[PDB]
Swiss-Prot record:
It is found in: Nucleus; Chromosome. The PHD-type zinc fingers mediate the interaction with E(z). In contrast to vertebrate homologs (PHF1, PHF19 and MTF2), the Tudor domain does not bind H3K36me3. The chain holds residues 339 to 404 of 1043 of the full protein. It comes from Drosophila melanogaster. Belongs to the Polycomblike family. This is Polycomb protein Pcl. Component of a form of the Esc/E(z) complex present specifically during early embryogenesis which is composed of Caf1-55, esc, E(z), Su(z)12, Pcl and HDAC1/Rpd3. This complex is distinct from the PRC1 complex, which contains many other PcG proteins like Pc, Ph, Psc, Su(z)2. The two complexes however cooperate and interact together during the first 3 hours of development to establish PcG silencing. Interacts with corto in vitro. Disulfide bonds: none annotated. Residues 14-69 form the Tudor domain.
């Protein structure tokens, strides 16, 4: 989804910086910690600990230390 991913919350609008670790939820419910390598306005390319790169929507990403953005 773009801007409004399917969640139990309104339309998320969060941004992240590259080279930053964030937790990513997969549809199975598990969260995988990964490092952001690229961003778009709709998704963030996360390179996980397993070095896989996936475009994850902003709803899947959670900040490690609160985040000011």
């Amino acid at each position: 989804g773009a801007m409004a991913p399917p969640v139990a919350a309104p339309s998320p609008a969060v941004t992240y910086a590259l080279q930053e670790d964030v937790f990513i939820k997969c549809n199975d419910g598990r969260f995988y910690l990964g490092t952001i390598i690229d961003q778009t306005s709709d998704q963030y390319l996360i390179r996980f600990d397993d070095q896989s790169e996936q475009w994850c929507e902003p709803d899947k990403l959670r900040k490690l230390g609160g985040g000011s953005s």
